């Protein structure tokens, strides 16, 4: 039963790592969209 | 004590599923904002 | 061994809380970028 719990924890940890990786990618893209809106407003208006 | 650990794991798993769902929604909206910035720049500039 | 499992669960929970916090911040910034694209399109076009 302990091994079953340990395996489930490993699975949750692995997925948490994937989620953290996704979040960093989202943050980077979000920063690029901020840049684009800022560049648009400045270059046009 | 094992049941207490198993219940906590279930709670963490449930919340992880909610987080994954939120992340997909964020990604989709982020893709729409990219589209909007791209469409703006192309249609105007 | 139970304490080791309980400590790992605490670590995963702590990181899950940080992730939830990050997600809320991403959502708020994403809402601001939506506002900016909407304001741009309306003010210009
Ligand atoms: Cl997670
Ligand atoms: Cl965006």
Author numbering:
A (entry chain A), B (entry chain A), C (entry chain A): 1 to 45
Question: How do the authors describe this structure?
Answer:
PIE12-trimer is a highly potent d-peptide HIV-1 entry inhibitor that broadly targets group M isolates. It specifically binds the three identical conserved hydrophobic pockets at the base of the gp41 N-trimer with sub-femtomolar affinity. The target of PIE12 is the highly conserved pocket at the base of the gp41 N-trimer, a parallel trimeric coiled-coil region of gp41 that is transiently exposed (“prehairpin intermediate”) during HIV-1 entry. PIE12-trimer prevents the folding of the N-trimer and C-peptide regions of gp41 into the 6-helix bundle (trimer-of-hairpins) structure required for membrane fusion during viral entry, and it inhibits all members of a diverse panel of primary Group M HIV isolate strains with high pM to low nM potency (IC50).
Eventually, HIV developed resistance to PIE12-trimer by mutating Q577 in the gp41 pocket. In the WT structure, Q577 hydrogen bonds with d-Glu9 and d-Trp12 in PIE12. Because our inhibitor is trimeric, we expect the impact on PIE12-trimer’s binding energy to be three times as great, corresponding to a geometric drop of binding affinity of 653 (or > 250,000). In an HXB2 pseudovirion, Q577R confers > 4000-fold resistance to PIE12-trimer.
